[PDB]
């Protein structure tokens, strides 16, 4: 799993 920034990555999974 990779993140560019964090807005989308931290909200892409419920947990």
């Amino acid at each position: 799993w990779g993140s560019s920034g964090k807005l989308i990555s931290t909200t892409a999974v419920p947990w």
Partner: antibody
Framework: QVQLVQSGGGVVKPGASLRLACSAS????????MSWIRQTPGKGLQWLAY????????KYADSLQGRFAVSRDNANNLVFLQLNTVEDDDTGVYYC??????????????????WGQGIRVTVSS | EFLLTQSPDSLAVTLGETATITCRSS????????????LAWYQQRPGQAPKLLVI???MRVSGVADRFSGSGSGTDFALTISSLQPEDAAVYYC?????????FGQGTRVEIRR
């Protein structure tokens, strides 16, 4: 201050090449993919290209037929777009944008959360 | 492959009333793995860059007025502006990120009715 300041652009003759630059400040540049997006009267708002954090992988809109080349310079917080073999459809306003997203083994999925001011590109002799 | 079509093309709205803009996707962009729609909304005022408003079809990003609400699922989405204010006159765009080749809708222009 968190921002993207664009430069370059301007007038380019049909068939020639033109370079666009964008300078990032106020955030960790190497934590982000970066994208270019243009707005032209004929094709609307159009995503053009993204470059991964370390500049090694690039993806482009297929309709550009490989004419555009994105690159980045992480030592100087710059990203670039080179327009080659330009044509009249390329006239418009070009934006750099910070690209916030996630990637798994299938691909990269993201949105454009911070934008440069836009630069005018005029294809004309 | 993935086409986004907005409607209407333009909309006149009386101040204080409600604007509704729709965005249709030719392909489903709800993923069952996380139950998220891979859809964003932007606002573009004259002479300015677009501004991100909404992610995951219905989640407002930081700083965005709560009179904006995104809704819908799958292939049919909407942006609703309650209590329209003068600063809300703008062109609105939807954008999918369901694939690595992102595209936008054609934009919906919201003007003030007088």
């Amino acid at each position: 201050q968190v921002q993207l300041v664009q430069s370059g652009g301007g007038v380019v003759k049909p068939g020639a090449s033109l370079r666009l630059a964008c300078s990032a400040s106020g955030f960790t540049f190497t934590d982000y993919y970066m994208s270019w997006i243009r707005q032209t009267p004929g094709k609307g708002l159009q995503w053009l290209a993204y470059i991964t954090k370390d500049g090694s992988e690039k993806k482009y809109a297929d309709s550009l037929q490989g004419r555009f080349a994105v690159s980045r310079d992480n030592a100087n917080n710059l990203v670039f777009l080179q327009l080659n073999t330009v044509e009249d459809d390329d006239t418009g306003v070009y934006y750099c944008a910070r690209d916030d997203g996630y990637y798994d083994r299938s691909g990269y999925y993201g949105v454009f959360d911070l934008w440069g001011q836009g630069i005018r590109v005029t294809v004309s002799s | 492959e993935f086409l986004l079509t907005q409607s209407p093309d333009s909309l006149a709205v009386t101040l204080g009333e409600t604007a509704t803009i729709t965005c249709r996707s030719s392909r489903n962009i709800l993923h069952s793995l996380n139950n998220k729609n891979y859809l964003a909304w932007y606002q573009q005022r004259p002479g300015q860059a677009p501004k991100l408003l909404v992610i995951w079809a219905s989640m407002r990003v930081s700083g965005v007025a709560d009179r904006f609400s995104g809704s819908g699922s799958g292939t049919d989405f909407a942006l609703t502006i309650s209590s329209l204010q003068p600063e809300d006159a703008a062109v609105y765009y939807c954008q999918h990120y369901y694939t690595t080749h992102r595209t936008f809708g054609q934009g919906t222009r919201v003007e003030i009715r007088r």
